[PDB]
Every structure is written in C-alpha cells, then in structure tokens.
Amino acid sequence: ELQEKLIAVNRVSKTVKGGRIFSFTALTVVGDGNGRVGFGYGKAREVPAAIQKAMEKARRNMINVALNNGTLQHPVKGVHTGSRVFMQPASEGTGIIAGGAMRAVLEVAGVHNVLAKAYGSTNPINVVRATIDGLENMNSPEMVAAKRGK
RNA sequence: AAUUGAAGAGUUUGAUCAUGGCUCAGAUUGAACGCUGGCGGCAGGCCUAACACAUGCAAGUCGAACGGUAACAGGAAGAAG
Ligand SMILES: [Mg+2]
Ligand SMILES: [Mg+2]
Numbered sequence: 318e319l320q321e322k323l324i325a326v327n328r329v330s331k332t333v334k335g336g337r338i339f340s341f342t343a344l345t346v347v348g349d350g351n352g353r354v355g356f357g358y359g360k361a362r363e364v365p366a367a368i369q370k371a372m373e374k375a376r377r378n379m380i381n382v383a384l385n386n387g388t389l390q391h392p393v394k395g396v397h398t399g400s401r402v403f404m405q406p407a408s409e410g411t412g413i414i415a416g417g418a419m420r421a422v423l424e425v426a427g428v429h430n431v432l433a434k435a436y437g438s439t440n441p442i443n444v445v446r447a448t449i450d451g452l453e454n455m456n457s458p459e460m461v462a463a464k465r466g467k
Numbered sequence: 468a469a470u471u472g473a474a475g476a477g478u479u480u481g482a483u484c485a486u487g488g489c490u491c492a493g494a495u496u497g498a499a500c501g502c503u504g505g506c507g508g509c510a511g512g513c514c515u516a517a518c519a520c521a522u523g524c525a526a527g528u529c530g531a532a533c534g535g536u537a538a539c540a541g542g543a544a545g546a547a548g
C-alpha cells in the first residue's frame with residue numbers, strides 16, 4: 318500500500334553569462350490510504366532525478382488527517398498563497414470528484430467520496446498544499462468533545 | 468422511494484508568484500451551410516416582412532316554427548304509353 322503519484326512536472330530557466338540553463342521540477346504526493354499524506358517538491362537538472370528527488374521529500378514531510386471512514390467529517394476550506402480550495406463530505410454515491418491535482422492527494426489520503434473545487438489560481442504547488450493544510454486543520458469528529466465535553 | 472450533489476486546461480515571463488483578459492473541454496437549438504445519406508417510431512417545421520396575396524376550402528343547420536313548390540322522386544280522380 319505504498320501508493321504515490323506525481324501531480325505536475327515543469328521546466329524552469331536560470332540564465333547565466335553563457336545562456337539559459339534549464340532544469341525541472343516535480344511535485345508529488347504519497348499517502349498510506351488511511352489518513353497520513355505528505356507532498357514533496359524537489360528540483361533537478363534532469364527530470365527523473367527531480368521526480369525521484371521529490372517522492373522522497375514527500376515520504377518525510379507527511380501529515381496525518383482524522384478521517385471518518387471513507388469521507389471527511391465536516392466540510393473544510395483550505396487556502397495557501399493564491400489557491401483557495403474547498404472540499405465537502407458528500408454522503409458518497411461515488412464521490413472522489415475533484416480538481417485532478419487535488420484528486421491526487423485526496424485518493425492517496427484515503428478519502429473515497431468527496432466533492433471539491435479550487436478557486437483562485439490552480440497553481441498545483443499551492444493547491445496540493447492548500448488542501449493538505451485543509452485536511453490538516455480538519456478536526457476530531459469526536460475529540461471536539463476533548464475540547465469540550467468539559 | 469421522490470432535487471442525497473460541485474473537477475479543470477491553454478496563453479503575458481528566460482523563469483517565477485500574483486493580478487487579469489482572451490481561449491478550450493460541457494450541455495442545449497424551431498436551426499443554416501459543406502460533405503455525405505439505408506429503413507422505421509414519436510416529434511418539430513417562416514425565428515425574417517403585424518410584407519402583399521390568385522384560386523379552392525375554413526359555418527352552418529332546422530320542413531317537428533312558416534307560406535310553401537323549383538329541382539327529382541314516387542305516387543293520383545283522372546287523361547292513357
Ligand atoms: Mg521547501
Ligand atoms: Mg516565451
């Protein structure tokens with residue numbers, strides 16, 4: 318149950334006396350399938366180097382999120398830089414409908430049946446990230462009782 | 468049981484993030500045109516000039532309201548084919 322997938326691979330340019338020196342960047346997401354998900358970025362002069370150098374970063378850099386069986390407990394909003402993301406429980410019929418790129422984090426995460434949309438820029442590096450922190454801030458469908466009960 | 472349902476992509480930059488317009492995937496149509504074209508079922512068919520219109524047809528019916536016979540039908544004292 319490794320389960321991983323890269324979301325966006327891109328090229329960039331550095332520019333020096335001798336001209337442009339190009340490079341690449343991968344952005345990836347690994348999840349266990351039962352909560353626990355992280356993303357990694359990582360960049361390198363050539364693509365395979367970078368997509369791999371990324372996968373690892375994600376293995377570390379990994380949060381975990383309090384699911385509720387196949388779905389989220391309540392609805393949540395996430396918002397990093399220019400991306401404002403919103404995703405919702407959805408008493409699954411099928412579900413998992415969302416902006417491929419946050420479908421990525423959502424399935425490896427293990428959510429099985431949510432609807433989402435991304436507002437603002439769909440800049441991958443900031444959505445997959447806005448959603449993570451999104452799922453992250455999410456909270457205990459029980460241990461709000463922790464907070465209260467008391 | 469009976470609205471229990473939401474995706475994003477391309478494009479300013481050497482490159483970047485943002486701002487932002489343009490653009491695309493969708494569905495829908497009383498449609499036209501180019502190419503092509505076998506059959507059926509249900510449907511639709513002047514969106515323009517409330518422009519103008521030849522011709523037929525689109526409102527008649529009742530003799531159980533009435534005087535009635537001109538048509539075609541029988542029939543009639545009776546005049547006969
Ligand atoms: Mg970093
Ligand atoms: Mg260019």
Ligand SMILES: [Mg+2]
Nearest residue numbers: 501502503504
């Ligand atoms: Mg033809």
